[PDB]
């Protein structure tokens, strides 16, 4: 269900608002200015937004005919963009509840928002239109925009009405004198949780205690918080460290476990239930990027399955904040709530108290609950102690939410919240790793013992049986270049970005490349042969290594498939030995034919790697030239990598007729097999014709010289 957006400008703010609501809703958008509408009998776009609807009115007439034809044949709706009251009888209303520009006398439209936003009926021209008067600044306009995307795709681009709010009270028992609570604030906190249990079912506050700085303030405040020792059954609690200290500053698992065990002793002596699988780091230190010892010490002494951070994948914008299941702990995005540690009074809020009243009545709070199914809110003790700011913000937030939305607001315990989060978003179960040094806030979150820039600058992708390990060796000969360490059984393959090794993490990948120094070479590389045909490898490789270079070599795909077939014949694999090559071109036969022929389709893999990496970073050679004259092609690689010093490869690469190749790895790269049969060569020349044609057009598109075998296959 791709959705096509037609922005008026690339820097237009309404395009950022519409794309912002679509990225907050995880709806897969297509950015375009002022194209092909179908993809071989299936619709390419499920919904259209014009950010300027006058583009559609003044459209090209043939293209308008194709647009209206594609809309009526596939049921595609168009969203337009040029006090406020909600229509109770409107079919647009799915999330919006009726509580507290465009004029047509003929009944051909539904006035959903009445002064603004209307829903034109589908029977006028076969297409459905939802038209917007103003932009997406008011919160009711964003509410009816979510309802507009919901109805026009037939609830395909929508979310369920069940909505989930977790409220964390961080910084409990941490403040100095004048910021902590007394008996009045604890009693008002319990009374507020009674009324919010009346509003939201099982709304119980989650409290981030710190046990060291309890019993150290005012004894009147300590007797003021002694009534919270009588109030333990009616409150949820999560550990927020003993001394509110950042977990990456410890950089030892054991002393962090002693701090968490001191908070565990505090939880036992208070009457706190040692349950619920939830805890949050103080400055979110160690959650993204992953400090392994925080994740290990969390589940060791607390059974943490859920944490929540705002650091993934970046701190700002909050629309991009995803969750990820790494190291057995299902991380969730955290939300800011508008409440901070410096806010202790209603009067001393930044921008006045009215700015808080915009944040409650339609700010980051309300669009956070509307656009996210799971919303974990951060509040601090200073918002509960003097003017009771968090009591104010949630007594007004759930009143606003139950007034204007018909959402099923339920507070489950955070294990059920994390299970619901990864049931709704199953694509976010895999983490997407990024560079810790690239964002300096993440580097502050990253531990100081971990050395920066331990990553490759070149990716020698495959495919297999082409000559990639000889190119790996010859790039290893250069003093300015340093090869990767061998990764145990897989050797010079790390197979990080394509397999299950991506779930091991950044620090597993960083161990193969040592610490940069004056003695060690700066430029680093790995040969990664399975990353060619893999679909998951280029996007993750562009995520972690944005400025890396891509080096592919390509030989004749009939001979590549033949050498791959003889490679599994020489590895004594039973299906490839059992059937001859004519039968190849059971499930093992189909798997062998798929990994023998889909690696031969060079264009479909170079499209993925070119969608990830820039074509300046991608360079393609001949491969047979690596067997005939390798010094000129190695001079071309040395010009490609941008190195300063240059090795004269004419004199150090010596031809060996005893091996048949310029030197080498001996028997494994010097195999001698009988030549391909003539009927098999006719079948494999006939099938590798169209793949060679789009391959030749692709290599002319890339600004690359075409190989020899491609030119004789194009001529014959």
């Amino acid at each position: 269900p791709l959705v096509l957006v037609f922005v008026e400008s690339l820097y237009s703010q309404l395009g950022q608002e519409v794309v912002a609501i679509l990225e907050s809703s995880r709806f897969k958008y297509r950015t375009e200015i002022a194209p092909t509408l179908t993809d071989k009998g299936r619709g390419r776009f499920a919904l259209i937004i014009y950010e300027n609807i006058l583009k559609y009115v003044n459209l090209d007439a043939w293209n308008r005919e194709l647009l209206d034809k594609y809309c009526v044949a596939y049921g595609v709706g168009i969203i337009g963009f040029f006090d406020c009251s909600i229509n109770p009888k409107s079919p647009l209303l799915y999330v919006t509840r009726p509580s507290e520009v465009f004029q047509s006398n003929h009944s051909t439209y539904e006035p959903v928002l009445l002064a603004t936003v209307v829903q034109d009926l589908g029977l006028h021209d076969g297409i459905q239109r939802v038209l917007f008067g103003n932009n997406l600044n008011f919160w009711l306009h964003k509410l009816v925009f979510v309802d507009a995307v919901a109805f026009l795709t037939g609830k395909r681009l929508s979310l369920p009405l069940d909505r989930y709010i977790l409220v964390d009270i961080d910084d409990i028992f941490v403040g100095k004198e004048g910021t902590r609570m007394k008996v009045e604030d604890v009693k008002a906190l319990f009374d507020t949780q009674n009324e919010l249990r009346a509003h939201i079912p099982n709304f119980t506050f989650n409290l981030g205690y710190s046990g060291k700085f309890f019993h150290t303030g005012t004894n009147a405040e300590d007797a003021g918080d002694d009534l919270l020792l009588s109030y333990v059954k009616e409150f949820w609690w999560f550990p927020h460290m003993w001394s509110h200290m950042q977990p990456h500053l410890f950089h030892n698992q054991s002393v962090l476990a002693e701090q968490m065990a001191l908070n565990k002793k505090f939880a036992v002596e208070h009457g706190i239930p040692t349950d619920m699988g939830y805890a949050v780091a103080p400055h979110h230190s160690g959650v993204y990027p992953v400090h392994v010892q925080l994740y290990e010490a969390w589940k060791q002494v607390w059974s943490i399955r859920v944490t929540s951070t705002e650091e993934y994948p970046h701190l700002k914008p909050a629309r991009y904040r995803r969750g990820f299941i790494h190291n057995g702990i299902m991380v969730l995005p955290r939300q800011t709530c508008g409440l901070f540690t410096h806010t202790i009074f209603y009067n001393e809020y930044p921008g006045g108290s009215s700015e808080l009243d915009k944040i409650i009545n339609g700010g980051e709070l309300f669009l956070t609950v509307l656009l996210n199914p799971i919303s974990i809110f951060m509040t601090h003790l200073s918002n509960y102690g003097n003017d009771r700011l968090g009591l104010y913000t949630f007594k007004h937030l759930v009143r606003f939410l139950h007034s204007w939305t018909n959402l099923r607001l339920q507070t489950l315990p955070p294990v059920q919240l994390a299970q619901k989060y990864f049931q709704i978003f199953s694509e976010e179960k895999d983490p997407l790793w990024q560079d810790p040094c690239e964002d300096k806030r993440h580097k502050d979150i990253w531990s100081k013992e971990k050395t920066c820039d331990r990553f490759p600058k070149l990716l020698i992708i495959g495919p297999q049986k082409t000559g990639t390990t000889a190119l790996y060796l010859f790039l290893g000969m250069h003093p300015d270049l340093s090869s990767n360490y061998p990764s145990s059984e897989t050797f010079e393959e790390i197979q990080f970005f394509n397999g299950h090794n991506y779930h091991k993490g950044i620090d597993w990948y960083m161990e193969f490349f040592p610490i940069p120094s004056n003695t060690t070479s700066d430029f680093y590389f790995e040969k990664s042969a399975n990353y060619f045909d893999s679909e998951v490898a280029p996007r993750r490789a562009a995520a972690l290594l944005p400025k890396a270079k891509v080096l592919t070599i390509l030989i004749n795909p009939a001979d590549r498939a033949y050498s791959w077939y003889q490679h599994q014949r020489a590895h004594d694999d039973p299906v490839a030995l059992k059937y001859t090559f004519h039968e190849v071109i059971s499930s093992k036969l189909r798997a062998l034919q798929n990994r023998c022929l889909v690696p031969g389709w060079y264009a479909t893999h170079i499209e993925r790697w070119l969608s990830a990496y820039h074509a300046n970073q991608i360079l393609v050679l001949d491969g047979k030239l690596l067997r005939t004259e390798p010094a000129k092609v190695m001079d071309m690689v040395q010009k490609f990598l941008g190195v300063t010093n240059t090795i004269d490869y004419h004199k150090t690469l010596a031809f060996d007729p005893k091996k048949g190749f310029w030197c080498c790895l001996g028997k494994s790269k010097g195999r001698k097999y009988p030549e391909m049969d003539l009927d098999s060569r006719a079948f494999l020349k006939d099938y590798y014709r169209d793949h060679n044609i789009e391959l030749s057009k692709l290599l002319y598109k890339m600004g690359q010289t075409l190989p020899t075998w491609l030119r004789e296959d194009l001529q014959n």
Partner: nanobody
Amino acid sequence: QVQLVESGGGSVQAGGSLRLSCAASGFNVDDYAIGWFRQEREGVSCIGGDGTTYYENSVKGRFTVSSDKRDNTVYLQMNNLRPEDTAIYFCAADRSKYCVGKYFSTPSQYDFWGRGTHVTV
């Protein structure tokens, strides 16, 4: 209480220099982003918590933002002043002190703002 107070105004009308002082009362100025926004709001400058400095292309050879920890005040030493520069300059605080080049111009990146002061060029 986080408060941002700014000052500085006028110019030599064909082009001159100023040092707009944004005082950060109630919090530390080396812990936040303190990016300057001119009027919608355009983020022409940003000064990171380690001192890392970003500009737009109109202001890249001209403006010089700076920071001083001692009076807790971020300064904007302006130079070679074009008539397009006249606006309301907003020193805005952000929890991420370090600036990123995609988002140091966005007003949605910056949480707590200032009163704003006018430069007339």
